[PDB]
Enzyme design. Structure first.
Site, PDB file in Angstrom:
ATOM      1  N   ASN A   1       6.926   8.589   9.564  1.00 42.10           N
ATOM      2  CA  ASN A   1       6.123   9.349   8.960  1.00 42.10           C
ATOM      3  C   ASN A   1       5.955  10.771   9.892  1.00 42.10           C
ATOM      4  OD1 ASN A   1       3.540   6.178   7.789  1.00 42.10           O
ATOM      5  ND2 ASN A   1       4.777   8.139   6.722  1.00 42.10           N
TER       6      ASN A   1
ATOM      7  N   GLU B   1      28.028   6.312  -7.251  1.00 42.26           N
ATOM      8  CA  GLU B   1      29.181   7.307  -5.920  1.00 42.26           C
ATOM      9  C   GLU B   1      28.226   7.602  -5.274  1.00 42.26           C
ATOM     10  OE1 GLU B   1      31.389   8.059  -8.512  1.00 42.26           O
ATOM     11  OE2 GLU B   1      30.602   8.333 -10.367  1.00 42.26           O
TER      12      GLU B   1
ATOM     13  N   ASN C   1       3.658  12.023   0.494  1.00 43.77           N
ATOM     14  CA  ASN C   1       3.516  10.988  -0.776  1.00 43.77           C
ATOM     15  C   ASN C   1       4.137  12.379  -2.183  1.00 43.77           C
ATOM     16  OD1 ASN C   1       2.755   8.887   0.076  1.00 43.77           O
ATOM     17  ND2 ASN C   1       0.831   9.605  -0.579  1.00 43.77           N
TER      18      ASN C   1
ATOM     19  N   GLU D   1      -3.662  -6.937  -1.814  1.00 42.75           N
ATOM     20  CA  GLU D   1      -4.637  -6.603  -1.891  1.00 42.75           C
ATOM     21  C   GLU D   1      -5.310  -5.738  -3.383  1.00 42.75           C
ATOM     22  OE1 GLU D   1      -5.503  -4.217   1.484  1.00 42.75           O
ATOM     23  OE2 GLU D   1      -3.463  -3.474   1.666  1.00 42.75           O
TER      24      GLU D   1
ATOM     25  N   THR E   1       0.554   3.247  13.447  1.00 42.24           N
ATOM     26  CA  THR E   1      -0.973   2.364  13.101  1.00 42.24           C
ATOM     27  C   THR E   1      -0.722   1.178  13.349  1.00 42.24           C
ATOM     28  OG1 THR E   1      -1.588   4.557  11.390  1.00 42.24           O
ATOM     29  CG2 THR E   1      -2.670   1.286  11.352  1.00 42.24           C
TER      30      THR E   1
ATOM     31  N   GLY F   1       2.826  -6.808   6.711  1.00 46.87           N
ATOM     32  CA  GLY F   1       3.095  -8.164   6.136  1.00 46.87           C
ATOM     33  C   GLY F   1       3.322  -7.676   4.653  1.00 46.87           C
ATOM     34  N   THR F   2       2.445  -7.319   3.757  1.00 47.17           N
ATOM     35  CA  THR F   2       2.910  -7.467   2.505  1.00 47.17           C
ATOM     36  C   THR F   2       3.785  -6.729   2.214  1.00 47.17           C
ATOM     37  OG1 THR F   2       0.043  -6.961   2.341  1.00 47.17           O
ATOM     38  CG2 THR F   2       0.693  -6.821   0.206  1.00 47.17           C
TER      39      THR F   2
ATOM     40  N   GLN G   1       0.641  -1.610   0.067  1.00 46.40           N
ATOM     41  CA  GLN G   1      -0.122   0.369   0.225  1.00 46.40           C
ATOM     42  C   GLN G   1       0.991   0.719  -0.192  1.00 46.40           C
ATOM     43  OE1 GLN G   1      -2.579   1.376  -0.077  1.00 46.40           O
ATOM     44  NE2 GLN G   1      -3.757   0.139   0.858  1.00 46.40           N
TER      45      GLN G   1
HETATM   46  N1  LIG Z   1       4.970   7.817   3.927  1.00 43.52           N
HETATM   47  C1  LIG Z   1       3.202   6.528   3.336  1.00 43.52           C
HETATM   48  N2  LIG Z   1       3.105   6.023   4.360  1.00 43.52           N
HETATM   49  C2  LIG Z   1       2.133   5.142   4.656  1.00 43.52           C
HETATM   50  C3  LIG Z   1       1.176   6.072   3.492  1.00 43.52           C
HETATM   51  N3  LIG Z   1      -0.001   4.422   3.873  1.00 43.52           N
HETATM   52  C4  LIG Z   1       0.594   3.676   4.542  1.00 43.52           C
HETATM   53  N4  LIG Z   1       1.789   3.937   5.279  1.00 43.52           N
HETATM   54  C5  LIG Z   1       2.554   2.995   6.485  1.00 43.52           C
HETATM   55  O1  LIG Z   1       1.992   1.815   6.142  1.00 43.52           O
HETATM   56  C6  LIG Z   1       2.336   1.203   7.087  1.00 43.52           C
HETATM   57  C7  LIG Z   1       1.166   0.009   7.429  1.00 43.52           C
HETATM   58  O2  LIG Z   1       0.602   0.573   6.514  1.00 43.52           O
HETATM   59  P1  LIG Z   1       1.580  -0.954   4.796  1.00 43.52           P
HETATM   60  O3  LIG Z   1       1.851  -2.514   6.479  1.00 43.52           O
HETATM   61  O4  LIG Z   1       2.435  -1.139   4.282  1.00 43.52           O
HETATM   62  O5  LIG Z   1      -0.012  -1.970   4.545  1.00 43.52           O
HETATM   63  P2  LIG Z   1       0.277  -2.547   3.232  1.00 43.52           P
HETATM   64  O6  LIG Z   1       1.104  -2.151   2.274  1.00 43.52           O
HETATM   65  O7  LIG Z   1      -1.086  -2.711   2.390  1.00 43.52           O
HETATM   66  O8  LIG Z   1       1.028  -3.865   3.835  1.00 43.52           O
HETATM   67  P3  LIG Z   1       0.032  -4.778   5.015  1.00 43.52           P
HETATM   68  O9  LIG Z   1      -0.552  -3.849   6.499  1.00 43.52           O
HETATM   69  O10 LIG Z   1       0.696  -5.722   5.775  1.00 43.52           O
HETATM   70  O11 LIG Z   1      -1.192  -5.705   4.252  1.00 43.52           O
HETATM   71  C8  LIG Z   1       2.057   2.322   8.401  1.00 43.52           C
HETATM   72  O12 LIG Z   1       2.965   2.494   9.819  1.00 43.52           O
HETATM   73  C9  LIG Z   1       2.573   3.922   7.498  1.00 43.52           C
HETATM   74  O13 LIG Z   1       3.345   4.454   8.298  1.00 43.52           O
HETATM   75  C10 LIG Z   1       1.031   6.634   2.789  1.00 43.52           C
HETATM   76  O14 LIG Z   1       0.511   6.506   1.890  1.00 43.52           O
HETATM   77  N5  LIG Z   1       2.666   7.236   2.388  1.00 43.52           N
HETATM   78 MG   LIG Z   2      -2.229  -4.130   2.829  1.00 42.92          MG
END
Ligand SMILES: Nc1nc2c(ncn2[C@@H]2O[C@H](COP(=O)(O)OP(=O)(O)OP(=O)(O)O)[C@@H](O)[C@H]2O)c(=O)[nH]1
Ligand SMILES: [Mg+2]
Lengths: 99, 31, 71, 40, 53, 82, 427, 53
Positions: free
Chosen positions: G196, G244, G218, G61, G169, G134-135, G10
């Site tokens: 974050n 470099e 972002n 997902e 989170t 996880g993902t 995500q």
């Molecule tokens: N910079 C940034 N970080 C994000 C954003 N959305 C989620 N995160 C980070 O991602 C963490 C949880 O999201 P992820 O674990 O990456 O969600 P995912 O990529 O679908 O992976 P899973 O949760 O395991 O399914 C949070 O602690 C946030 O710090 C975003 O839009 N921008």
């Molecule tokens: Mg996810």
């Protein structure tokens, strides 16, 4: 007539190839054995310098089908002129000089 | 209750499959 | 009876999963074996090329030494 | 004696490991099977 | 039958060779450690002798 | 022609084997020599910081030699520096 | 000179959603892919004025992948690279690495390899992921290991997000980060670190916004990526490339975790009033509040810093500014390196996104520095993982999904070893 | 060709088998010899060390 003259040419070519190949092999072996003799002379000089300067306390020179066994013996001699003894000595000595 | 007999056959081949999969994992590593 | 049949269904699904795993592993193994034999062939070809280069090398060294002697 | 007192310690006398252990375990298992088959 | 024997012998030779390679390298490193230890202890003895002199 | 080809092939094979074995031997010898010259260079660089004391007496104030007691004078010099 | 971009999870693909908007704006490519040499790093050309990115977006997902499949950038991408699994890893390392991770990695790798084949001259991989779940963690670790096995010598840059020290989170992200460092340390080659909460505070302080959504984060990370890669594309006085970076910012093999900063990260109403010349933007790039990671550099020492100046920059004011930075006292470089800076300049001014928060600034500076100020982050994560590992909490999920005990034992000892390594290289 | 391959592969198999066994025995003897051998050189210098003492 074509095949007769071809036979004669084949005989002449056979003689020529025999002489050329034998001469070439002999000459190349002589040259490269001279080269390896020079290299082992350099190794002996290095060993003498290392012993007499650093830690020798005494340094002593060495002494000095059928063709296949002769060549194997020659290469084995010229690679075993310097022993595992001396190789390990050199490695440990290099580490000690570093520290 | 021949269901139980056929189930037992499934169990035996399951054990054989476990052993074979272990063999194949080792095979893959060495290859 | 229903307990035994549920055990049977579980055994069937486990057997299918293990069979799929075995199929994937063995197919990958066959690909690995093919790869290994072909790269061994390539290595042998490289060995032959290196030997030929060495022979050309000492030929050239012979020529150099002869010209040096003439000089 | 002061210099003798100085410096007595010199006076007197991972993931890669895990991966190598895994590879050796697999090859040992394969050897076990290989000599099992060879014996029988 | 001979082709099958070729395959079997090739495979078992490969695995045995890999075991040989591993054991050779780590026997080499163990030997190096042994050499370092013996040289170190002889150095310590020599230093003790120099202090005694 | 069969005699031709057999003889020429034999000569080619003998040249091949000679060249390969000789190249291996030379590579081993050159490795040994490189180790030796690195050792000499380290000795040359190290003796720069030595004082004239140990520049002229690096050893102290008759059978063959064993590898264990093989470096004793060098350890004497090391201990002097320590 | 080209670099591939892979976005896992995500957070990674959401960041890429702004990165590619920024890239198209930079290079003039319309969203559909037309322009009415400089882009070759990021795009491959074809058709009648058509360009397609050198990126893959993969996620389990499909809820978010559909957003990019439909949202105004459908024509941009190749409609195969948008990988979609079947169900989320559910913050589970074992579900993302062992259960489901073994089914999509083949389709991901067989696409990465063909993109590399299409690429003219490969120069690096750059991977977007967050170790907070996880993902991201598990699957990115697996894929990074696979790439290291396959290619190996080619450079890898992990633009990785750690969880914040307190603003967290997920509940299992300590576990997930501790189990993902086992790859993020040993398989990638340069780690560019994010957080974050640091961006939250940066945009609260300078960008004067109190309720920042993920869009702001972002965008101001896409700006950092663009400033990082500008040297590959555009012309400059002292162009500095990925090799470099590697040779200058990695003193030891297992010390590659570098901070980041950008300046001027300024509004549109202060831009005219407050002056943004080099001699002050360089200073504004060194305060501890402008670091994109919630860390305090005053608690450690700087090993090696690298500066990239986009826009109107002359190579003497950089020298003067670096001299001022060295003569300053509030910071203290490691006594190892006198020459602790890696200067670099470009010529393309910073590229504003229309409707964005930043402004049309004549010049900008991106700084990436390796310093001992991250052992604190490692220690805090280790502590907050050990405490939850004490009572054997949340571990039955991983146990049932594939992990047993050795994963946790080795991850714990590995993180301990890394913290000790930073401690011993400090002084 | 198959029989020559069988014979060569069998010879290589056996020879590598004895070499593997002997290097394993070298391992086993070296591990035991490690601790014992170190003290031996200490006693070698022990005589002169005690004389100096
Ligand atoms: N910079 C940034 N970080 C994000 C954003 N959305 C989620 N995160 C980070 O991602 C963490 C949880 O999201 P992820 O674990 O990456 O969600 P995912 O990529 O679908 O992976 P899973 O949760 O395991 O399914 C949070 O602690 C946030 O710090 C975003 O839009 N921008
Ligand atoms: Mg996810």
């Amino acid at each position: 007539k074509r095949i007769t003259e071809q036979f004669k040419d084949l005989q002449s070519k056979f003689r020529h190839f025999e002489l050329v190949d034998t001469k070439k092999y002999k000459e190349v072996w002589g040259m490269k054995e001279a080269d390896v003799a020079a290299l082992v002379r350099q190794l002996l000089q290095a060993d003498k310098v290392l012993h007499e300067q650093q830690l020798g306390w005494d340094w002593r020179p060495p002494d000095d089908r059928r063709a296949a066994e002769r060549e194997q013996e020659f290469w084995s001699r010229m690679t075993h002129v310097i022993s595992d003894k001396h190789t390990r000595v050199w490695g440990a000595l290099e580490k000690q000089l570093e520290k | 209750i021949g269901c139980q007999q056929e189930l037992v056959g499934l169990q035996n081949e399951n054990g054989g499959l476990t052993e074979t999969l272990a063999r194949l994992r080792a095979e893959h590593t060495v290859l | 009876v229903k307990r035994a049949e549920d055990d049977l269904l579980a055994a069937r699904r486990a057997n299918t999963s293990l069979r799929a795993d075995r199929a994937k592993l063995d197919e990958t193994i066959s690909t690995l074996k093919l790869e290994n034999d072909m790269v061994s062939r390539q290595v042998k070809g490289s060995v032959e090329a290196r030997e030929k280069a060495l022979v050309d090398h000492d030929v050239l060294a012979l020529e150099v030494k002869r010209l040096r002697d003439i000089l | 004696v002061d210099l003798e007192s100085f410096l007595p310690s010199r006076l007197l006398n991972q993931r890669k490991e895990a991966a190598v252990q895994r590879d050796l375990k697999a090859i040992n298992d394969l050897l076990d099977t290989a000599k099992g088959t060879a014996g029988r | 039958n001979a082709e099958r024997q070729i395959k079997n012998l090739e495979w078992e030779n490969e695995v045995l060779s890999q075991r040989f390679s591993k054991v050779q390298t780590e026997r080499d490193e163990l030997y190096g450690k042994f050499e370092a230890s013996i040289y170190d202890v002889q150095q310590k003895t020599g230093l003790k002798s120099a202090l005694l002199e | 022609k069969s005699s031709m080809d057999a003889f020429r092939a034999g000569q080619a094979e003998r040249l091949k084997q000679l060249s390969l074995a000789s190249s291996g031997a030379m590579e081993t010898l050159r490795g040994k020599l490189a180790v030796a010259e690195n050792v000499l260079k380290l000795a040359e660089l190290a003796r720069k910081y030595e004082t004239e004391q140990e520049k002229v007496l690096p050893f102290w104030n008759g059978s063959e030699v064993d590898e264990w007691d093989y470096l004793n004078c060098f350890f004497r010099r090391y201990n002097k520096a320590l | 000179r080209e670099v591939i971009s892979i976005h896992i999870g995500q957070a990674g693909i959401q960041v890429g959603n702004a990165c590619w908007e920024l890239y198209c704006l930079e290079h003039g490519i319309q969203p559909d892919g037309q322009m009415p040499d400089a882009f070759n790093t990021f795009f491959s050309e074809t058709g009648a004025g058509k360009h397609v990115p050198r990126c893959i977006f993969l996620d389990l997902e499909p809820t978010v992948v559909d957003e990019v499949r439909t949202g105004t950038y459908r024509q941009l991408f190749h409609p195969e690279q948008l990988i979609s699994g079947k169900e989320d890893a559910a913050n589970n390392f074992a579900r993302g690495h062992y259960t489901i991770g073994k089914e999509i990695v083949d389709l991901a790798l067989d696409r990465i390899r063909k993109l590399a084949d299409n690429c003219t001259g490969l120069q690096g991989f750059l991977v977007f992921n967050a170790v907070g779940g996880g993902t991201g963690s598990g699957l990115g670790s697996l894929l990074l290991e696979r790439l290291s096995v396959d290619y190996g010598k080619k450079s890898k840059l992990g633009f990785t997000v750690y969880p914040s020290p307190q603003v967290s989170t997920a509940v299992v992200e300590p576990y997930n980060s501790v189990l993902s460092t086992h790859s993020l340390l040993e398989h990638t080659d340069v780690a560019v670190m994010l957080d974050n909460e640091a961006i939250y505070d940066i945009c609260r302080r300078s960008l004067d916004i109190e309720r920042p959504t993920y869009t702001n984060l972002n965008r101001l990370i896409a700006q950092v990526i663009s400033s990082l890669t500008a040297s590959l594309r555009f012309d400059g006085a002292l162009n500095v490339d990925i090799t470099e970076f590697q040779t200058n910012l990695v003193p030891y093999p297992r010390i590659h975790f570098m901070l980041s900063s950008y300046a001027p990260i300024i509004s549109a109403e202060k831009a005219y009033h407050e002056q943004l010349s080099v001699a002050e933007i360089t200073n504004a790039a060194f305060e501890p509040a402008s670091m994109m990671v919630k860390c305090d550099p005053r608690h450690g020492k700087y090993m090696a810093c690298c500066l990239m100046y986009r826009g109107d920059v002359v190579p003497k004011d950089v020298n003067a500014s670096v001299a001022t930075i060295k003569t300053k006292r509030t910071i203290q470089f490691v006594d190892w390196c006198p020459t602790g800076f890696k200067c670099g300049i470009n010529y393309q001014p910073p590229t504003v996104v229309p409707g964005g928060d930043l402004a049309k600034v004549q010049r900008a500076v991106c700084m990436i520095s390796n310093s001992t100020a991250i052992g604190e982050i490692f220690s805090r994560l280790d502590h907050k993982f050990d405490l939850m590992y004490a009572k054997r909490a949340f571990v039955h999920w991983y146990v049932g999904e594939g992990m047993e005990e050795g994963e946790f034992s080795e991850a714990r000892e590995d993180l301990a070893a890394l913290e000790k390594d930073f401690e011993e290289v400090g002084a």
